Amino acid sequence: HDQLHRYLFENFAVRGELVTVSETLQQILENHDYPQPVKNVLAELLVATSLLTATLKFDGDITVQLQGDGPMNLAVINGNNNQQMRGVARVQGEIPENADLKTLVGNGYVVITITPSEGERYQGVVGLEGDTLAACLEDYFMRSEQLPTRLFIRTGDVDGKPAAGGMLLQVMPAQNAQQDDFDHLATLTETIKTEELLTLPANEVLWRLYHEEEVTVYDPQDVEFKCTC
Amino acid sequence: HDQLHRYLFENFAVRGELVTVSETLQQILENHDYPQPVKNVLAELLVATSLLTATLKFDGDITVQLQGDGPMNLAVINGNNNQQMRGVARVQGEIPENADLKTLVGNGYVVITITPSEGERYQGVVGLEGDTLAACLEDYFMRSEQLPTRLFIRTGDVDGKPAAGGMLLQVMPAQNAQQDDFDHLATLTETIKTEELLTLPANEVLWRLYHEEEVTVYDPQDVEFKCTC
């Protein structure tokens, strides 16, 4: 059906997504004569990328790429915020029949590149260590994103043709947070002078800036030098 | 004073942090004979890293590094979740008197490496394009983190000695979100069978999994192939 559905669990403050991408998948695999395991990896990257593309806050494109020292040294899917997808895989050898994700890629990484329509490019990387792509990607999110995130990816055949789908769950940012408010806190915070920040006690810096707002302060943490003597 | 303070704006659901890091800064600059602009860059990276280290959800360390083709080809600060900091800068030439961030580093990048005590390493990168480090880092966050984030960094001298400080604002993850709940949604979501996901209509997949929860569904998005014919 090739559609991605967005939904919100009102009571848990968690968003979810579901995508089945299979007419798109066929156009991506079409006339490349990819062996089977390669076909599956791409079907999986396709779902992953489509699910991530939907979480984008700004217009731009995202690429989720696998590269390594294995028979399949490259697999990539690139998608934009309009859900237009494309990709390829490069093979250079020994693809065993029941290739593993680790077997296909070998020693490698999962590289995610986010290019905003406006601004500049960002790229993030984690070693490929999970057994599954969904698992590798959750490793990436766990280290790079505060909001807990889960990915579920399925692939198989339907009507003898390739088909795949997947779902995502991500904690939402607090309801309370208004955009104009956050911006106000920031503008306010920027009125801090170097001298005030560097010479006055912490509490005073805080009431001088935020006495109008309700603020809970926690126990401070000593910052110290990491010695080698 | 070398302490980092955490606080929460109860009504806006935004967390904030404030750090002054100046006895630590002296131990980092001590006996390296760094020119002035280099001293400042490191004071700035020190505050940035200390502010980020506090946002860590798990134990581990974080490094914020600048590398480029300028007189100061390398500057790094590494900190752990216990706020122990360390670092260096490598100079290889022409540091003009009033060196720019762009002047010092030249053409380069901001590289952030997050190494969990347990798991594996993650690294993210953006080109160095902002005029200030705080600005470069906000570029990084804008592309890699859903939760809006702002950084304020100040450096100067106090008692003739080097001193620096900074503050952070970050939207919090929704209050509603319980950990055990998110986990329940996930376990539930994982009971989806490939065949159900790939053969059944989207709505049915959703009520079969989530009929007990209150769920708002939004208009689907067509996923399509990006053509070149």
Ligand SMILES: [Zn+2]
């Ligand atoms: Zn020492």
Ligand SMILES: [Zn+2]
């Ligand atoms: Zn075409």
